[PDB]
Design a protein around this ligand. Structure first.
Ligand SMILES: [K+]
Ligand SMILES: [K+]
Ligand SMILES: [K+]
Ligand SMILES: [K+]
Ligand SMILES: [K+]
Ligand SMILES: [K+]
Ligand SMILES: [K+]
Ligand SMILES: [Mg+2]
Ligand SMILES: [Mg+2]
Ligand SMILES: [Mg+2]
Ligand SMILES: [Mg+2]
Ligand SMILES: [Mg+2]
Ligand SMILES: [Mg+2]
Ligand SMILES: [Mg+2]
Ligand SMILES: [Mg+2]
Ligand SMILES: [Mg+2]
Ligand SMILES: [Mg+2]
Ligand SMILES: [Mg+2]
Ligand SMILES: [Mg+2]
Ligand SMILES: [Mg+2]
Ligand SMILES: [Mg+2]
Ligand SMILES: [Mg+2]
Ligand SMILES: [Mg+2]
Ligand SMILES: [Mg+2]
Ligand SMILES: [Mg+2]
Ligand SMILES: [Mg+2]
Ligand SMILES: [Mg+2]
Ligand SMILES: [Mg+2]
Ligand SMILES: [Mg+2]
Ligand SMILES: [Mg+2]
Ligand SMILES: [Mg+2]
Ligand SMILES: [Mg+2]
Ligand SMILES: [Mg+2]
Ligand SMILES: [Mg+2]
Ligand SMILES: [Zn+2]
Lengths: 110, 53, 118, 119
RNA sequence: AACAGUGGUAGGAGAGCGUUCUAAGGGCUGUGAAGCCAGACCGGAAGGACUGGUGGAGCGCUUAGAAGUGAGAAUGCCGGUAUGAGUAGCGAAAGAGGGGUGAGAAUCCCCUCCACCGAAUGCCUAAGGUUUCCUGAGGAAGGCUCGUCCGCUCAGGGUUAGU
RNA sequence: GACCGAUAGUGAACCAGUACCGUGAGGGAAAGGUGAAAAGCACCCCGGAAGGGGAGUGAAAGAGAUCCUGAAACCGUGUGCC
RNA sequence: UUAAGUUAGAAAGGGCGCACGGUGGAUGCCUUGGCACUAGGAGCCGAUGAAGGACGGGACGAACACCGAUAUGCUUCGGG
C-alpha cells in the first residue's frame, strides 16, 4: 500500500529542489528525515514537510507502520512561473523566471 | 562570445553528471540516537563527546 | 465562410513524427528536423534498395571465390568453366552451396575444371 | 600565515578585539568557525598577560581589550576580569585556555558556526 | 490484348486528396458526438479507416454548391517554452557579540562596545509626490538574499491659524 | 445572413478607449467557459501557512475556483534493449 | 599451479523505446459580443443652461449602474 503527499506551487526553482530529492529517493523514511535535517539547502525544510505529511497520511489514513516505510517515489515537477523583469543598463529589461515546484513524495511499506 | 549552437538535452545532462549534492557526513548520536554531523554538537540533544553542551 | 486551420495540420505533422520514432534527440521530437530526416530516409532507402542488390552479389562472389580456391580454381576460371559446361546456377545459389553443401559445390567445380582442361 | 576573515587590517583587528572582550565577559560565545579559530590564539595570548599580572602586562592587555563592563553588580571591567577571575582560574593550566565546538551551518548563509568557550 | 513510353528547374496541361459552410437525401450519437492520446490496418500520392483510452454533446456519409480551403522558412506577428546556466550579476560603505521575539533569525527588536558623515550623510523649507505619516495586525506578491521586518498588504487613526 | 466564433469577430464578448506609454497632440493592450444545481469540500490527519491525504457533495472532484476539452515545445520519475 | 589464448560483464552518467506525470493553452464544442444588411421609425440638442464631465447620494468599504442635498429616488396617471 502507498501514501502520497504533494506540496503544489512552492516558491523554489525545480532544479534546486531536485538536488535534494536525489539524496532521499529510495531511502528508508527515518534515514531520509535525517539527510534532510543535515543537508544545508533551501529545499530541505520544504521537502521534509512533504515527507512528514506523507508519513502522517500513511499512519492516519491507511494504518501503515511508520518505521517500515520507504520512499517509493520522489519527484519535483515544474509549477507555474512568476515572470518578473530586472532593469538592465541602457534602458533594457531582462526577464527573471521566479519558478515554482510541485513536490511529490510517495511512501510505501518495505 | 555567444553559443554558436544550442546545447542538446543530452549534452546538458552529461554536463550535470557531477552537479550533485553529497550525502551529509553523518553519524548516530551516542546520547540521543538522532543523526548528527560527525565532529559537530548534536542539535537535537546538545551533546558532544558524552557531555551536555 | 471562414475555414480555421483546425486539426489537419496537427494530423499531418504527427504522422511525420511517428515515422521519425527511434531517431536521435530532436530528430524524433521536432517536426521540422523530423520531416527533413524522414525525407532524407526516403532518398537513402531508394538508393539502398538498389545498393542491396550490388552488396549481396559482391558477398556471393567473395564466398564462391573462397570455395573455388579450396578446389584449386579462382572465381574467374570457375565461372568461365560453368558457362562452358552450360551450368546456369546463379551466384546466390553457388554461394549457398559453398556454405551449406560444399560437396555439391565441389561437383560443380569439378564440372567446371573438366571444361577448362579440354 | 593568518586568516584575513574578509576584512581590512584595521577592521579585522577591531573585530578580533571585540570578540576577545566578548569571550572574556561571556565565557562562551557563538560565532563562525573560522572566526573562532583565529580568536583562540588572540584570547589565549591575552590570558597569558593576565596570568603574568604585572603592570606592564596589564597595559599591554589594556591596549587590546575593549572598555566594557564584565560584571555590572561589582562594576568590573573586562580588563579587570581578565587579571582577576580568568588569570586565577588558569594559574596551573599551561596553554589551551579555550575550546571550539562545531555547531554546523546557519540558515541565512550556510556559514559553519561554532561555540568558543573558556575551558 | 499487343506494341511503345514514363529524370526534370522555369513553365503549360490533366486527374485527384483534404478543410469550413450550404442544399437535398440518408444516417450516427449519453448503450457516449466532436476533439485529444496510442497502435503492428488500408489506398499509387494527397490521405482514409478500425480498435482501445480520455472526453462529455454533438457529428458523419452521398450528390451538388460556395470559399477567409491546406505553411516550414517572410531578420514574418502573437503566445508559450527552451539554450546559454545553476552561469553573469545581487548597484560605492564596519561591524561584533549578548539578550529578546518567533514555526523559522547574518538580515527584525533591545543592549553594549566599535565604526562612518558632520558647509553634511545634520536641522529647516521649496518644487514635485499624494497618505508614503501614526497605531495594531499580516507575510502570498514587491524587497536583487532572508525576513518575525518594511516606503509592501489589511484595518483603524492622524493635518486645528484675524497674526 | 452557404457572415465571425475568443490570435476570429469591433480596439473592446470581461468595469476598454480602461491599464500602460507619451510634456502634449496622440498611441493603445492583455483578459470568455466549475457544475444541472453551490450541493463551493462539515469533520479528521500532517503543516505556522501554503499545500496536501482521507471523509463528504456530485453523474464526474484527474469538474475544487485564470476550476469544459487539455495538443506540441519544454521539464521530470520509472526501466526493456544499447 | 604456470604459460599462451579467447570471451564475458561493468554504467559515473548517457542513447532509443515504453509507461506515468508536470508545465502550457493548441484543438473541439460552446456564446455573453461582434460584422453585414433589410423593413419601418426618427434624423437634432442648447441661455427654460446643451453635449460631455466633476463631486456627491445606500444600513453596509471601493467600483459599476442608477439618481442629484427631494440624491440607491419624489408626485401623478395607466399597466401588472
Ligand atoms: K473518442
Ligand atoms: K517563422
Ligand atoms: K569638507
Ligand atoms: K510587521
Ligand atoms: K485586440
Ligand atoms: K527514458
Ligand atoms: K546504464
Ligand atoms: Mg535610465
Ligand atoms: Mg464557423
Ligand atoms: Mg495554420
Ligand atoms: Mg545492377
Ligand atoms: Mg587605517
Ligand atoms: Mg562586545
Ligand atoms: Mg517526363
Ligand atoms: Mg527514364
Ligand atoms: Mg496550370
Ligand atoms: Mg466542426
Ligand atoms: Mg474511436
Ligand atoms: Mg488561408
Ligand atoms: Mg556552481
Ligand atoms: Mg560558461
Ligand atoms: Mg565563473
Ligand atoms: Mg560572481
Ligand atoms: Mg548593496
Ligand atoms: Mg570621522
Ligand atoms: Mg511607517
Ligand atoms: Mg524574498
Ligand atoms: Mg479556444
Ligand atoms: Mg479580440
Ligand atoms: Mg501621464
Ligand atoms: Mg479527466
Ligand atoms: Mg458541459
Ligand atoms: Mg481544464
Ligand atoms: Mg435664446
Ligand atoms: Zn543527540
Amino acid at each position: 500500500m502507498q501514501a502520497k503527499a504533494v506540496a503544489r506551487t512552492v516558491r523554489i526553482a525545480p532544479r534546486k529542489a531536485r538536488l535534494v530529492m536525489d539524496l532521499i529517493r529510495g531511502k528508508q523514511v527515518g534515514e531520509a528525515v535525517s539527510i534532510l535535517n543535515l543537508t544545508p539547502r533551501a529545499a530541505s525544510p520544504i521537502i521534509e514537510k512533504v515527507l512528514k505529511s506523507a508519513i502522517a497520511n500513511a499512519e492516519h489514513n491507511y494504518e501503515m507502520d511508520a518505521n517500515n516505510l520507504v520512499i517509493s517515489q520522489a519527484f519535483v515537477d515544474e509549477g507555474p512561473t512568476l515572470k518578473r523583469f530586472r532593469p538592465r543598463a541602457m534602458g533594457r529589461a531582462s526577464q527573471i523566471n521566479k519558478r515554482t515546484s510541485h513536490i511529490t513524495i510517495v511512501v510505501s511499506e518495505k | 562570445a555567444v553559443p554558436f549552437r544550442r546545447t542538446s538535452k543530452m549534452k546538458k545532462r552529461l554536463r550535470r553528471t557531477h552537479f550533485k549534492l553529497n550525502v551529509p557526513g553523518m553519524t548516530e548520536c551516542p546520547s540521543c540516537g538522532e543523526m548528527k554531523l560527525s565532529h559537530r554538537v548534536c542539535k537535537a540533544c546538545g551533546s558532544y563527546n558524552g557531555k551536555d553542551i | 465562410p471562414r475555414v480555421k486551420g483546425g486539426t489537419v495540420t496537427r494530423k499531418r505533422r504527427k504522422k511525420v513524427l511517428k515515422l521519425a520514432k527511434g531517431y536521435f534527440g530532436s530528430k524524433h521530437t521536432l517536426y521540422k528536423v523530423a520531416n527533413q530526416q524522414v525525407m532524407k530516409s526516403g532518398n537513402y532507402a531508394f538508393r539502398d534498395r538498389r545498393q542491396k542488390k550490388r552488396d549481396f552479389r559482391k558477398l556471393w562472389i567473395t564466398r564462391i571465390n573462397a570455395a573455388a580456391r579450396m578446389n584449386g580454381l579462382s572465381y574467374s576460371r570457375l565461372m568461365h568453366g560453368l558457362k562452358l559446361s552450360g551450368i546456369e546456377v546463379n551466384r546466390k545459389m553457388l554461394a549457398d552451396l559453398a556454405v551449406n553443401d560444399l560437396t555439391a559445390f565441389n561437383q560443380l567445380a569439378d564440372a567446371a575444371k573438366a571444361q577448362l582442361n579440354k | 600565515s593568518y586568516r584575513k576573515l574578509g576584512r581590512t587590517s584595521a577592521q579585522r583587528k577591531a573585530m578580533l578585539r571585540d570578540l576577545t572582550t566578548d569571550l572574556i565577559i561571556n565565557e562562551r560565545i557563538e560565532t563562525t568557525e573560522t572566526r573562532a579559530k583565529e580568536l583562540r590564539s588572540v584570547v589565549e595570548k591575552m590570558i597569558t598577560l593576565g596570568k603574568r599580572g604585572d603592570l606592564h602586562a596589564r597595559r599591554q592587555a589594556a591596549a587590546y581589550i575593549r572598555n566594557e563592563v564584565a560584571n555590572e553588580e561589582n562594576n568590573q571591567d573586562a580588563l579587570q576580569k581578565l587579571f582577576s577571575d580568568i588569570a586565577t582560574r588558569y594559574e596551573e593550566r599551561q596553554g589551551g585556555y579555550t575550546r571550539i565546538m562545531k555547531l554546523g551551518p546557519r540558515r541565512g548563509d550556510g556559514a559553519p558556526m561554532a561555540i568558543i568557550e573558556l575551558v
